[PDB]
């Protein structure tokens, strides 16, 4: 389709030469899912403001209130460098020489008697 | 092609399962997009009790899940588990066959037996022999 | 954007998408590029012409952008050529300062070497009698070890994964060629025995309670023969397993995956022991220390953590990269961790203090392979540009560049002697480089004017049948092992 | 305890989904086949979920039988809180 | 994306009268999210070592951006269907959009392929790449033969095994011919050994020598590595000669073992008919020689039977267009042998074999183009050769079709 020939140009502009026939089919399925949840929330915000026409400020509101919840990101550099210097200040602990298999405390490991039901 | 038959042997088994579940007190001759919809919700449902009952047992420091980890997994998906002993004892209950195996012969090769050359001392004996 | 260099083409297409402010407010790589300073190493002979065109008030605003967003690191020497500037640029915050590459690095091996660190610098574990028994049979293999050089080219034994319709994402081989691990896209780790000795689990606790200990053979009486396969499958990752690392005592497989956990699998019980949850993001690599206690894992969250197999929390967080930490490699003395990354930089990190002691820039793509020389003096890095750049560590001048490969170089290893560096890429080739003639020559200027020695340093190319060379391993008798997953 | 007494009767009773297919999608998520009766409960719990939707989409087809459509799945999953999407491509 | 498409989606939802700037606002937002995901799905492709961008890469790229790889359905509840994917929807552009619900049940499920195994081989032996199937590969001076002495010894062992003194030796040597990758550059000496052999092996009609050479030809043909149509011209006479030549030994007994020769020989000729084909050179040349062998007057009953067999496996249309106008001649030949009355000559055996083969071919030639009505005495319009027995053969073919 046309909505599908533009999807092969978004990938080729990102240098994706080799793809699968269904990669296009489900990016269109995501793009349809994303616009029918912006516009669904846009008329909810239009009925809040009591206007019969969903205008551009309703879509400006529904985009930035969906991007505040859906599309997150990794933590920022000023947050990663603060938790690093709070952690990298603590000196390395010494090792007990014959403690055995070096493991965390048993409530942090996956080593339990690990039961199962009796077959009857 | 045996490459896509790794996936299509089990997804087209789930298509026979939905086609056998929509016939039991129900339909004949369903729409095509309605069958690939329902068998996509079936694969996503088995894959969700796979990821969540493994998560509930490993939270309790175990590695394989018991019955008490699935009856809490199905509760967290809203299943009402008590209705399942009545569903299992249907008279309409059917069994869908498992998919066939690609290597039906298993051992059909006479082979080509050729031996020449030994091993230098930097190659141990368990590596393959030098060819002809 | 058209009058840029050809090796910036993947960098500009991320910028063509960025047109709004809120698009850039959640990128976190261009957010760290806007706040950092480009280092821009220039000579004093060319800086005098630049400052005589910027200190005048005719321009007066591009000079304001330069002294706000760009560092300028000046060296007194000859202006570099264009094919020498092309060799050492390509990274955001590129061509780092020489004041970063002047710290004292203990790049020597442990046991005199003045470049060696003391044994009590990093608290390394004890050497047990079973670990001392390993080095006794290791030097029997060293007796049969061949000197490779440019004349006695090694034999390559390719261990191809034939069916592999779940995509193979991680390979590791033990130090003695006895086990081969496979990380796959169907969230499994699969251990294969390659010696004629099946993989056995130890007996259950009821069977061990009836036998006696200190029988001077108890390392055989505990192995269960009821469980004996040539293949053990390990389940428990909820995602494709991207890292795979054996421990040097041949227990303790490590695996990292997309689900954000690093997992420690036993090789005596063949179960999972610990799940190390520090990343919320795909951990792209992990590796045990060559002494086997610490391990480093680098992930999508742009840090590399140092763990110790005893704490649920890490010990060191190496948090200076601006993109994903693709690779994490330990030094042969395990006092230093090299972390290649997707922002085209390689960084050495001291295990004490967590400080970055070296920054190696000059790759044009994300670094997908690192290896150290067995001397500890050199470091080979490979990336998606097909370039293998050989770096010094005491000087870190990257004395060499190997540009034979076409696609992403995904595996490097030096020989056991150090005579040959083996390179494997997505070109389905295993190239062998002369790793003695590459370091034969090895400052006050930060470069050595490296030549085009690539043609001379090639010993062979070895095209593989439709199979990308994921791993490269050197047997202790100097035999190349490679593993590929035939496509 | 009825559900323990129910699962102990599942050495027989092959369900509608095979255990080679239910066990495949369980192995994909880390669930390994320790007990084959455990697989048959998960295969029964996944049947009952699909059967409860096809039995409620039939009530939305009698008011407007003989064909299941997307406009029957749309009000049937709406009480479940699931908004189904028409392909429209 | 085309803005016209977004308008179609909007008015098919209940949102009518949308402006163009409202509609252009939709198609740059969703085209960014497709570009954001396809750039993010290329990370999983490059970490897959697959350079493919499979359908599962977008499932992990969506989950990475905190969007459900839920396709075709969206759960505002989320609890039952979390970030686990359902593998997409197997839908097409050229699909039927309606199927019968028992068509999906009655089709056979595809075969689950083999599990992953670890095989080792040798990329390099001290610098040299071996040619194993796992790998891609004034006095003038005294010259050397272009074969090695290991290769020359291999040729001697394979040829002395292929003359069939022991059957297991033959069978391995035949498999060795069938899959040796380095059997090129030895192929002139094999073709010359075959050709020369049949010609001095029909001087005395030594059937085994010939049956072994025809099996050697068949083992030469199915080898995929070697290039055969440089030796195809030499090969055509040797395979063809065994099938239709006279037999200097005994025609009456080893008749069947000679028809079994004609079978494994029809195999190499059939390969020659199907492969190596260019315009009007090979297939039409052997077809013309077979037809002038047939139209030949007073032909040997051995040459006649062999040529009849040769023209018989020429496929579907060849018997549809050639065997048709000749039934009367076949019947007259059968009647003359029957008159005899001497049965001393191999003529009676040749006649019976020819008639049986012709009748079987005529049976499907009939089963193929016409209904099975009036199978009792309508074949008496075709001289009544096979008649009701031909009808029974057609019925057996119909039963096989029903089983299929």
From Swiss-Prot, chain B:
Phosphothreonine: which positions carry it?
A: 107
**Domain of life of the organism encoding this protein:** Eukaryota
Chief location category: nucleus
Q: Where in the cell is it found?
A: Nucleus; Cytoplasm
Q: Which GO terms describe its biological process?
A: cell differentiation; DNA-templated transcription open complex formation; inner cell mass cell proliferation; maintenance of protein location in nucleus; mRNA transcription by RNA polymerase II; positive regulation of transcription initiation by RNA polymerase II; regulation of fat cell differentiation; RNA polymerase II preinitiation complex assembly
Record bears the keyword Transcription? yes
Give the GO cellular component terms, alphabetically: nucleoplasm; nucleus; perinuclear region of cytoplasm; transcription factor TFIID complex
**In what residue span(s) does the Histone-fold domain sit?**
12-79
- Keywords assigned: Acetylation, Cytoplasm, Developmental protein, Differentiation, Intellectual disability, Nucleus, Phosphoprotein, Transcription, Transcription regulation
Query: What factors induce this protein?
Result: Induced with triglyceride accumulation.
Q: What else is known?
A: 'Taube nuss' means 'empty nut' in German.
User: What does the comment on domains in this protein's record state?
Assistant: Ectopic expression of the histone fold domain acts as a dominant-negative mutant resulting in differentiation inhibition.
- Give the family this protein belongs to, as stated in its UniProt record: Belongs to the TAF8 family.
Q: What is this protein called?
A: Transcription initiation factor TFIID subunit 8
Originating species: Homo sapiens
Q: Give the gene symbol.
A: TAF8
Swiss-Prot record, chain C:
**What biological-process terms (Gene Ontology) are attached?**
DNA-templated transcription initiation; mRNA transcription by RNA polymerase II; positive regulation of DNA-templated transcription; positive regulation of transcription initiation by RNA polymerase II; regulation of DNA repair; regulation of transcription by RNA polymerase II; RNA polymerase II preinitiation complex assembly; transcription initiation at RNA polymerase II promoter
Q: Which UniProt keywords apply?
A: Host-virus interaction, Nucleus, Repeat, Transcription, Transcription regulation, WD repeat
Q: Which domain of life is it from?
A: Eukaryota
The principal location of this protein is: nucleus
Q: Name one GO molecular function term.
A: RNA polymerase II general transcription initiation factor activity
Q: Cellular component per GO?
A: actin cytoskeleton; chromatin; nucleoplasm; nucleus; SAGA complex; transcription factor TFIID complex; transcription factor TFTC complex
The protein's location, in the record's own words, is: Nucleus
Q: Where are the WD repeats?
A: 163-202, 236-275, 278-319, 320-361, 362-401, 404-442
The entry assigns this protein to a family as follows: Belongs to the WD repeat TAF5 family.
The record's domain comment reads: Distinct domains of TAF5/TAFII100 are required for functional interaction with transcription factor TFIIFB (RAP30) and incorporation into the TFIID complex.
- Full protein name: Transcription initiation factor TFIID subunit 5
Source species, please? Homo sapiens (Human)
> The organism's lineage?
Eukaryota, Metazoa, Chordata, Craniata, Vertebrata
Full-protein residues shown? 268 to 798 of 800
Curated annotation (Swiss-Prot), chain D:
Please state the span of the N-terminal signal peptide per the UniProt entry: none
| Modifications after synthesis and translation | Allysine formation by LOXL2 results in release of TAF10 from promoters, leading to inhibition of TFIID-dependent transcription.
**Localization annotation:** Nucleus
Q: What does the entry note on its domains?
A: The [KR]-[STA]-K motif is specifically recognized by the SETD7 methyltransferase.
Assembly behavior: Component of the TFIID basal transcription factor complex, composed of TATA-box-binding protein TBP, and a number of TBP-associated factors (TAFs), including TAF1, TAF2, TAF3, TAF4, TAF5, TAF6, TAF7, TAF8, TAF9, TAF10, TAF11, TAF12 and TAF13. Component of the TATA-binding protein-free TAF complex (TFTC), the PCAF histone acetylase complex and the STAGA transcription coactivator-HAT complex. The PCAF complex consists at least of TADA2L/ADA2, TADA3L/ADA3, SUPT3H, TAF5L TAF6L, TAF9, TAF10, TAF12 and TRRAP.
Q: Provide the family line.
A: Belongs to the TAF10 family.
What's the stated role of this polypeptide?
The TFIID basal transcription factor complex plays a major role in the initiation of RNA polymerase II (Pol II)-dependent transcription. TFIID recognizes and binds promoters with or without a TATA box via its subunit TBP, a TATA-box-binding protein, and promotes assembly of the pre-initiation complex (PIC). The TFIID complex consists of TBP and TBP-associated factors (TAFs), including TAF1, TAF2, TAF3, TAF4, TAF5, TAF6, TAF7, TAF8, TAF9, TAF10, TAF11, TAF12 and TAF13.
Organism, by scientific name, is Homo sapiens (Human)
Swiss-Prot record, chain E:
The terms describing its cellular component in GO are: cytosol; MLL1 complex; nucleoplasm; nucleus; protein-containing complex; SAGA complex; SLIK (SAGA-like) complex; transcription factor TFIID complex
The Gene Ontology terms for molecular function here are:
aryl hydrocarbon receptor binding; DNA binding; protein heterodimerization activity; RNA polymerase II general transcription initiation factor activity; transcription coactivator activity
Q: In terms of one coarse class, where is the protein primarily found?
A: nucleus
Instruction: Point out residues bearing the modification Phosphothreonine.
Output: 107, 179
Q: Which residues carry this modification: Phosphoserine?
A: 195
Residue numbers of Phosphotyrosine PTMs: 184
Q: What is this protein's record name?
A: Transcription initiation factor TFIID subunit 6
Gene symbol?
TAF6
């Amino acid at each position: 389709p046309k909505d599908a020939q533009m999807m092969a140009q978004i990938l080729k502009d990102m240098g994706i030469t080799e793809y699968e026939p269904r990669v296009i089919n489900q990016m269109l399925e995501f793009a349809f899912r994303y616009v029918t949840t912006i516009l669904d929330d846009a008329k909810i915000y239009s009925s809040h403001a009591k206007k019969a026409t969903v205008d551009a400020d309703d879509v400006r509101l529904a985009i930035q209130c969906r991007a505040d919840q859906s599309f997150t990101s990794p933590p920022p550099r000023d947050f990663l460098l603060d938790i690093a210097r709070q952690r990298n200040q603590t000196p390395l602990p010494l090792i007990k020489p014959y403690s055995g298999p070096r493991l965390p405390p048993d409530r942090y490991c996956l080593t339990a008697p690990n039961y199962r039901l009796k077959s009857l | 092609n045996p490459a896509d038959n790794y996936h299509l042997a089990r997804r087209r088994t789930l298509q026979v399962v939905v086609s056998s579940l929509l016939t039991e007190a129900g339909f004949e001759s369903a729409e095509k997009a309605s069958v690939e919809t329902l068998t996509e919700m079936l694969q996503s449902y088995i894959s969700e009790i796979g990821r969540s009952a493994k998560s509930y047992c490993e939270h309790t420091a175990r590695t394989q899940p018991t019955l008490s980890d699935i009856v809490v997994t199905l509760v967290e998906m809203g299943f009402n588990v008590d209705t399942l002993p009545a569903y299992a004892k249907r008279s309409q209950r059917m069994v869908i066959t498992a998919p066939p195996v690609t290597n039906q012969p298993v051992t059909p090769k006479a082979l080509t037996a050729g031996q020449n050359r030994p091993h230098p001392p930097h190659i141990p004996s368990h590596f393959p022999e030098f060819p002809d | 954007h058209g009058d840029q260099e050809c090796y910036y083409q993947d960098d500009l297409r991320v910028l063509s998408s960025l047109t709004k402010k809120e698009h850039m407010k959640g990128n976190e790589t261009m957010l760290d590029f806007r706040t950092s300073k480009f280092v821009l190493r220039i000579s004093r002979d060319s800086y005098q012409l630049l400052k005589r065109h910027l200190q005048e008030k005719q321009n007066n605003q591009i000079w304001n952008i330069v002294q706000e967003h760009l560092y300028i690191d000046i060296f007194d020497g000859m202006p570099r050529s264009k094919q020498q500037i092309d060799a050492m640029v390509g990274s955001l915050a590129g061509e780092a300062k020489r004041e970063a590459n002047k710290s004292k690095v203990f790049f020597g091996l442990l046991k005199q070497d003045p470049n060696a660190p003391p044994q009590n610098r990093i608290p390394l574990p004890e050497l047990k009698d079973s670990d001392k028994l390993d080095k006794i049979m290791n030097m029997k293999e060293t007796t049969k070890r061949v000197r490779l050089g440019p004349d006695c080219l090694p034999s390559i034994c390719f261990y191809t994964f034939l069916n592999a319709y779940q995509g193979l994402t991680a390979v590791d081989v033990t130090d003695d060629s006895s086990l081969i691990a496979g990380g796959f896209a169907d969230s499994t780790v699969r251990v294969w025995s390659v010696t004629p000795k099946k993989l056995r689990s130890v007996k259950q606790a009821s069977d061990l309670s009836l036998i006696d200990k200190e029988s001077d053979d108890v390392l055989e009486r505990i192995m269960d023969e009821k469980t004996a396969s040539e293949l053990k499958i390990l389940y428990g990752h909820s995602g494709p397993v991207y890292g795979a690392s054996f421990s040097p005592d041949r227990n303790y497989l490590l695996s990292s995956s997309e689900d954000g956990t690093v997992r420690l699998w036993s090789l005596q019980t063949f179960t999972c022991l610990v799940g190390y949850k520090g990343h919320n993001y795909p951990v792209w690599d992990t590796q045990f220390s060559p002494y086997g206690y610490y391990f480093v894992s680098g992930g999508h969250d742009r840090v590399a953590r140092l763990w110790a197999t005893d704490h649920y929390q890490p010990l060191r967080i190496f948090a200076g990269h601006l993109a994903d930490v693709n690779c994490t490699r330990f030094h042969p003395n395990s006092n230093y961790v090299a972390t290649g990354s997707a922002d085209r930089t390689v960084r050495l990190w001291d295990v004490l203090n967590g400080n970055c002691v070296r920054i190696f820039t000059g790759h044009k793509g994300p670094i997908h392979s690192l290896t150290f020389s067995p001397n500890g003096r050199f470091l080979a890095t490979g990336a998606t540009d097909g370039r293998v750049l050989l770096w010094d560590i005491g000087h870190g001048l990257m004395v060499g560049e190997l540009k034979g490969h076409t696609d992403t170089v995904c595996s490097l290893r030096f020989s056991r002697d150090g005579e040959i560096l083996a390179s494997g890429s997505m070109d389905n080739t295993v190239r062998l480089w002369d790793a003695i003639k590459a370091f034969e020559d090895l400052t006050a200027t930060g470069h050595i004017n490296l030549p085009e020695n690539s043609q001379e340093l090639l010993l062979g190319t070895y095209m593989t049948k439709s199979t990308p060379v994921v791993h490269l391993h050197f047997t202790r008798r100097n035999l190349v092992l490679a593993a590929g997953a035939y496509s | 305890t009825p559900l323990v007494d129910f699962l102990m009767q599942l050495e027989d009773y092959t369900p509608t989904i095979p255990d080679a297919v239910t066990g495949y999608y369980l192995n994909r998520a880390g669930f390994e086949a320790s007990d084959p009766r455990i697989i048959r409960l998960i295969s029964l719990a996944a049947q009952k979920f699909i059967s409860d939707i096809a039995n409620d989409a039939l009530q939305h087809c009698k008011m407007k039988k003989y064909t299941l459509t997307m406009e029957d799945l749309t009000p049937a999953l709406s009480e479940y809180g699931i908004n189904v999407k028409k392909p429209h491509y | 994306l085309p803005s016209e498409s977004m308008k179609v989606v909007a008015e098919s939802m209940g949102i009518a009268q949308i402006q163009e700037e409202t509609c252009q606002l939709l198609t740059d937002e969703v085209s960014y999210r497709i570009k954001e995901i396809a750039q993010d799905a290329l990370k999983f492709m490059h970490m897959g070592k697959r350079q493919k961008l499979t359908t599962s890469d977008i499932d992990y790229a969506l989950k990475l951006k905190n969007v459900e790889p839920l396709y075709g359905f969206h759960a505002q509840e989320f609890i039952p269907f979390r970030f686990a994917s359902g593998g997409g929807r197997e839908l097409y552009f050229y699909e039927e959009k309606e199927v019968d619900l028992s068509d999906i049940i009655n089709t056979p499920l595809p075969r689950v392929p083999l599990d992953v195994c670890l095989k080792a081989h040798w990329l390099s032996i001290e610098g040299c790449q071996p040619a194993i199937p796992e790998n891609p590969p004034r006095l003038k001076p005294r010259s050397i033969h272009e074969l090695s002495v290991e290769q020359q010894l291999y040729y001697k062992e394979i040829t002395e095994a292929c003359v069939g003194s022991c059957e297991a030796k033959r069978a391995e040597a035949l498999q060795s011919i069938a899959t040796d990758p380095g059997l090129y550059q030895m192929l002139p000496r094999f073709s010359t050994f075959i050709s020369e052999g049949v010609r001095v092996n029909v001087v005395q009609n030594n059937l085994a020598l010939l049956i072994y050479l025809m099996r050697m030809v068949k083992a030469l043909m199915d080898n995929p590595t070697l290039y055969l149509e440089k030796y195809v011209h030499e090969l055509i006479p040797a395979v063809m000669t065994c099938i239709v030549s006279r037999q200097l030994c005994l025609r009456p007994d080893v008749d069947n073992h000679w028809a079994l020769r004609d079978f494994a020989a029809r195999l190499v000729a059939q390969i020659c008919k199907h492969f190596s084909t260019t315009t009007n050179n090979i297939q039409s040349r052997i077809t013309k020689t077979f037809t002038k062998s047939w139209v030949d007057e007073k032909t040997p009953w051995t040459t006649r039977y062999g040529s009849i067999a040769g023209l018989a496996e020429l496929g579907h249309d060849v018997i549809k267009t050639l065997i048709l106008p000749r039934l009367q001649q076949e019947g007259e030949r059968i009647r003359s042998v029957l008159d005899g009355p001497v049965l001393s000559n191999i003529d009676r055996i040749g006649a019976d074999h020819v008639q049986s083969l012709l009748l079987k071919h005529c049976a499907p030639v009939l089963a193929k183009l016409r209904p099975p009505p009036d199978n009792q005495d309508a074949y008496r319009a075709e001289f009544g050769s096979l008649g009701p027995l031909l009808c029974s053969q057609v019925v057996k073919a119909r039963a096989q079709a029903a089983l299929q």
